[PDB]
C-alpha cells in the first residue's frame, strides 16, 4: 500500500459516494486493508480531503505560478481556468477543495505567487485579495455548477412557458451557451477591475 | 392542524441545531410532533425544504432584489451582494442551503423586474444575467469559503506562523486580524468596476 494507491482509490470512492459519503472506514474497506494500515497514510477525513485536493490540483496542473513572459492578467486568467477544470475533474471537487490551505511544502509557490503580483505594483494586501477574488469566484462557479446538477434531479422541471420574457431569454441563453461563457465573462470583470485597481 | 408558517420556523430552528447535513423531513416531523404524511403536504422532500428555507431566509432579511427609487445600478448590485451575504450568514449553513436554489414561479415578477432594471441601464440581457450571476456566485463562494476554512482549521494541526515566508506571513496576518469582510468588499468592487467598463 503506497500513498498514490490510497489517493487513486480515494478519488474513485469520491466519485462513487460523493464527499458526504466518504469515510476512512469506507476507504479502508475499498483498499482491502485494515483501519490501522490506512491511518499512517491518512489520519482522518480532513487529511483525506487535503490529500485529495492536492492530487486534483497536481494532476490538472493548476497554474499557481506565471510562465516566463506571462502578464499578470494572463496568469490570473490561467489560474482560474485551470482551477476550474481541476475542481470539475471529480464529483464534489469544489467542496473537497473548499477547506484546503497551502501546505508547508507549497509555501515557496505561495510566496512566488504573491511576489509576482507585488512586482507588478500591487500592494501585498491587494495581491492577496486579487488572488482570493479569483479563487472565490472560481470555487463559487463550480460549487454552483455541481450543486445545481444534483438539485435538478430532485424537483419538478420548470416550464419555459410560465416564465416572463426576459427571464425566459435568460433560461435560453444558458442552454444555448452552457456555463463556460458566463465564467469567462465574470473572470474578465475581475481582471478589468484589477487593472483599474493597479492604476490607483 | 399544521400551517406552513410553523413548518418553516421549526425548520429554521432545526437547521441551527443540526446544520444542513443533519436536516431531514423525518427530524422535522419529529420536532413538530406530526407523522411524515402530515408533513408531506407542506414539504415533499429534503430539496423542497431547502428551497422553502432559502426563500424564507432571503425574504426575512429583505435581500435586495429590487432597486430603491433612484438607486444607481452600482449601488443596487452592492446592496444585492451585501444583503445576500447578510442572509447567508444569519443562519447556520445558510449558503449551503442557498447554493442549489433557483427562482420559483412566485418570484418570477421579482426576477423579471431585476433583469428589466439592469437592461434599462443599457446592459444587454446577456450582460445583466451574467452580472447578477457573477455577484451571486462570488457572494456564495465568499461565505462558503470562509465557513469551511474555520471548520477545517479545527480538524487539523495548527501551523506555526514563523514557519511561513514573509509575504505569506503578512497575508495570513491581514486575514486573521481583519476578518472576512474586506476581501468580500474588495472583490465586489472589482466586479462593479468591470461592469462599468463593459457598459
CATH of residue B173's domain is: 1.10.357.10
- By the 8 A CB rule, do B149 and A95 touch? no
- Say how far apart CA B124 and CA B117 lie, in whole Å: 11
Best residue of A102, A133, A148 to probe chain B, by most B CBs closer than 10 Å: A133
Nearest neighbour of B165 by CB, restricted to A111, A170, A173: A111
Residue A117 lies in a domain: yes
Q: Looking at the complex, report in whole angstroms how far the Cα of residue B108 sits from the nearest Cα belonging to chain A.
A: 7
The structure was resolved to a resolution in Å of: 2.4
Across the interface, whether the CB atoms of B166 and A190 are under 8 A apart is answered: no
* B144: closest chain A residue by CA: A98
3-state helix, strand, coil in chain B (%, to 5): 75, 0, 25
* B49: closest chain A residue by CA: A155
Q: Looking at the complex, report in whole angstroms how far the Cα of residue A62 sits from the nearest Cα belonging to chain B.
A: 18
Residue A71 lies in a domain: yes
Q: Does A123 touch chain B (CB under 8 A)?
A: no
Q: Looking at the complex, report in whole angstroms how far the Cα of residue B35 sits from the nearest Cα belonging to chain A.
A: 22
Best residue of A87, A113, A128, A180 to probe chain B, by most B CBs closer than 10 Å: A128
Q: What is the 3-state secondary structure (H, E, C) of chain A?
A: CCHHHHHHHHHHHHHHHHHHHCCHHHHHHHHCCCHHHHHCCCCCHHHHHHHHHHHHHHHCCCCCCCCCCCCHHHHHHHHHHHHHHHHHCCCCHHHHHHCCCCCHHHHHHHHHHHHHHHHCCCCHHHHHHHHHHHHHHHHHHHHHHHHHHHHHCCCCCCCHHHCCHHHHHHHHHHHHHCCHHHHHHHHHHHHHHHHHHHHC
Q: Does A163 touch chain B (CB under 8 A)?
A: yes
Is B49 buried (19+), middle (13-18) or exposed (0-12) by CB count in 10 A?
buried
- Say how far apart CA A180 and CA A92 lie, in whole Å: 18
Range of the domain at A132: 65-199
Q: What does the CA dihedral B110, B113, B115, B118 come to, rounded to 10 degrees?
A: -130
Residues of chain B with C-beta less than 8 angstroms from the C-beta of A141:
137, 141
Residue B54 lies in a domain: no
Across the interface, whether the CB atoms of A148 and B182 are under 8 A apart is answered: no
Residue B4 lies in a domain: no
- Say how far apart CA B180 and CA A132 lie, in whole Å: 11
Experimental technique: X-ray
Residues 2-31 of A with CB under 8 A from B: 20
Across the interface, whether the CB atoms of B138 and A136 are under 8 A apart is answered: yes
Across the interface, whether the CB atoms of A166 and B119 are under 8 A apart is answered: yes
- Say how far apart CA A63 and CA A75 lie, in whole Å: 8
The grid cell for A19 is 464527499
Residue B167 lies in a domain: yes
The grid cell for B25 is 423531513
How many domains in chain B? 1
Please name the residue that has the C-alpha cell 399544521. Answer: B2
- State the Cα angle at A158 between A155 and A162, rounded to 5°: 150
* A180: closest chain B residue by CA: B130
Return the sign of the alpha-carbon dihedral for residues A68, A71, A74, A75: positive
Please name the residue that has the C-alpha cell 469566484. Answer: A137
Residue B164 lies in a domain: yes
Residue B48 lies in a domain: no
Across the interface, whether the CB atoms of B167 and A194 are under 8 A apart is answered: no
Residues 54-93 of A with CB under 8 A from B: none
Q: Which 3 state secondary structure label does DSSP give B71?
A: coil
Residue A33 lies in a domain: no
Amino acid at each position: 500500500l503506497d500513498k498514490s494507491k490510497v489517493i487513486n482509490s480515494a478519488l474513485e470512492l469520491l466519485n462513487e459516494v460523493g464527499i458526504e459519503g466518504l469515510t476512512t472506514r469506507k476507504l479502508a474497506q475499498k483498499l482491502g486493508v485494515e483501519q490501522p494500515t490506512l491511518y499512517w497514510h491518512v489520519k482522518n477525513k480532513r487529511a483525506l480531503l487535503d490529500a485529495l485536493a492536492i492530487e486534483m490540483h497536481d494532476r490538472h496542473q493548476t497554474h499557481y505560478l506565471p510562465l516566463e513572459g506571462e502578464s499578470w492578467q494572463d496568469f490570473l486568467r490561467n489560474f482560474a481556468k485551470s482551477m476550474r477544470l481541476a475542481l470539475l475533474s471529480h464529483r464534489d471537487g469544489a467542496k473537497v477543495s473548499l477547506g484546503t490551505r497551502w501546505t508547508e511544502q507549497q509555501y515557496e509557490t505561495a510566496e512566488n505567487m504573491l511576489a509576482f503580483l507585488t512586482q507588478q505594483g500591487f500592494s501585498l494586501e491587494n495581491a492577496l485579495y486579487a488572488t482570493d477574488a479569483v479563487r472565490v469566484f472560481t470555487l463559487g462557479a463550480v460549487l454552483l455548477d455541481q450543486e445545481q446538477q444534483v438539485a435538478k434531479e430532485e424537483r419538478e422541471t420548470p416550464t419555459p412557458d410560465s416564465m416572463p420574457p426576459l427571464l425566459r431569454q435568460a433560461w435560453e441563453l444558458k442552454v444555448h451557451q452552457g456555463a463556460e461563457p458566463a465564467f469567462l465573462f465574470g473572470l474578465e470583470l475581475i481582471i478589468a477591475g484589477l487593472e483599474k485597481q493597479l492604476k490607483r
